[PDB]
Amino acid sequence: QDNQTINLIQSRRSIRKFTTEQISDEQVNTLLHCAFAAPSGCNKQPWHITVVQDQKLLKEISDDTLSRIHEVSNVEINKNFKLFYGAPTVLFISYDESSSWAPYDIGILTGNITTAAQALGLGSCIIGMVRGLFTPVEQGDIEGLVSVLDKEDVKESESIKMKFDTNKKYRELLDIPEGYSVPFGIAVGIPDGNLPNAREVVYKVSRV
Amino acid sequence: DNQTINLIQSRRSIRKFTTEQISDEQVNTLLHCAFAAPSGCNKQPWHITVVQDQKLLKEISDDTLSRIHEVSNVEINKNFKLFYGAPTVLFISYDESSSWAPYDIGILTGNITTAAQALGLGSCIIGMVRGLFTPVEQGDIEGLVSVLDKEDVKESESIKMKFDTNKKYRELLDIPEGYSVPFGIAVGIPDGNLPNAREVVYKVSRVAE
Ligand SMILES: Cc1cc2nc3c(=O)[nH]c(=O)nc-3n(C[C@H](O)[C@H](O)[C@H](O)COP(=O)(O)O)c2cc1C
Numbered sequence: 055q056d057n058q059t060i061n062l063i064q065s066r067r068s069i070r071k072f073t074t075e076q077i078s079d080e081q082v083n084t085l086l087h088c089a090f091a092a093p094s095g096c097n098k099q100p101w102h103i104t105v106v107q108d109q110k111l112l113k114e115i116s117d118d119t120l121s122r123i124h125e126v127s128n129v130e131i132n133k134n135f136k137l138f139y140g141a142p143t144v145l146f147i148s149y150d151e152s153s154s155w156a157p158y159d160i161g162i163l164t165g166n167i168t169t170a171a172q173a174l175g176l177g178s179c180i181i182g183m184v185r186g187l188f189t190p191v192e193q194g195d196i197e198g199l200v201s202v203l204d205k206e207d208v209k210e211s212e213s214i215k216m217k218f219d220t221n222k223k224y225r226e227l228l229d230i231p232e233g234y235s236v237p238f239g240i241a242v243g244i245p246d247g248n249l250p251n252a253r254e255v256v257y258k259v260s261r262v
Numbered sequence: 263d264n265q266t267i268n269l270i271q272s273r274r275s276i277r278k279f280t281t282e283q284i285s286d287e288q289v290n291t292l293l294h295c296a297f298a299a300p301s302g303c304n305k306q307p308w309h310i311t312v313v314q315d316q317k318l319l320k321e322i323s324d325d326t327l328s329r330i331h332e333v334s335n336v337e338i339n340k341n342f343k344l345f346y347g348a349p350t351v352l353f354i355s356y357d358e359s360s361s362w363a364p365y366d367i368g369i370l371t372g373n374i375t376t377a378a379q380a381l382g383l384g385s386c387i388i389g390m391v392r393g394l395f396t397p398v399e400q401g402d403i404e405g406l407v408s409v410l411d412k413e414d415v416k417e418s419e420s421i422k423m424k425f426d427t428n429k430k431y432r433e434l435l436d437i438p439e440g441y442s443v444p445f446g447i448a449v450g451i452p453d454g455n456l457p458n459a460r461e462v463v464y465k466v467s468r469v470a471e
Pocket residue numbers: 092093094095096097155158159162273274275276277386387388389390391445460
């Protein structure tokens with residue numbers, strides 16, 4: 055329609071090419087405000103957001119991710135590939151894994167962020183995280199370190215130590231709450247070039 | 263003064279609606295918006311069932327209450343409207359096969375929620391319906407008891423149901439096979455002026471530059 059909100063929602067696409075220009079603190083605040091205005095089952099708001107503008111840290115996550123993908127699935131990705139498409143800001147979304155509604159809740163929250171970015175003249179792409187890099191240390195790493203003790207110096211042994219260190223490092227740097235999972239981030243920036251064409255939607259609908 | 267920003271920031275769950283049905287074009291716009299959401303791997307692993315038949319909605323509402331009574335001592339009065347008398351309910355379902363699907367479905371649900379506001383409408387997500395397909399959860403029951411007139415609730419002994427709500431609604435809502443059904447969305451014309459925005463809390467941390 056000629057309703058501006060409807061047109062953004064219907065024309066949204068993922069942005070994977072950004073300028074080098076950082077978004078303003080006011081735009082960040084606005085995105086956060088929008089995010090935390092989402093509804094949530096029982097108003098628990100069982101979520102957290104980490105605002106990241108450290109390109110070194112983002113580059114490290116990108117490198118570990120691509121490396122893990124190469125080593126586990128044996129696909130070759132171009133070494134110039136950027137997990138976060140060079141976005142100047144990324145919002146890491148985490149949630150309480152003991153709330154039954156929480157995965158849905160953070161999708162709604164992510165939708166608010168996505169639409170708000172569009173309304174500010176910005177663009178985004180959601181970015182899936184490798185669970186193994188962000189799991190809390192108590193979810194499988196402890197018995198890993200234990201077993202490694204009786205496997206003195208093997209390769210599988212060195213990678214268990216790195217996993218633990220990586221998991222500890224990323225959860226601390228991002229200030230992930232205890233018991234929270236980090237399934238994805240949202241890369242946010244100023245799109246470089248024209249926007250991709252609107253999706254031709256598919257109506258996966260029944261009626262009564 | 264961006265209108266889209268002010269809508270997202272002022273959104274509330276609406277639970278009182280006029281008796282006027284929304285137009286087919288509104289219904290279609292809500293769907294178009296829903297189906298424009300991002301999706302992990304572009305699976306778009308979702309489905310919507312549009313229900314405007316008040317007879318069916320009553321039976322769903324009743325069966326949800328019966329289902330609650332099966333697993334606990336709480337007898338909720340069948341006059342209670344689970345969907346707050348909304349004239350349209352959108353039942354959201356999805357393929358558990360896709361790892362990204364629960365998040366996709368949240369985003370789809372957000373798009374619907376915001377689009378409804380944009381159209382002069384309002385909405386409430388109704389999670390209690392999942393108890394028709396999966397074992398009724400204790401927290402859901404307490405979530406619902408919290409909002410009932412005390413006249414609407416009594417403690418009574420459990421009553422076993424004659425039939426399977428899961429099969430019954432998987433057929434009447436034409437839910438694709440194996441799809442999970444986490445909630446319905448009640449949509450309608452709000453009865454009365456819009457409430458104020460609520461206090462927003464920032465559950466946030468920051469890193470560098
Ligand atoms: C996944 C989900 C399930 C919900 N289930 C219900 C429900 O069964 N009934 C209801 O009245 N509200 C339900 N809500 C609405 C919430 O109670 C509401 O979003 C929250 O209390 C905050 O109020 P607000 O939406 O006005 O900001 C649900 C919300 C979500 C996101």
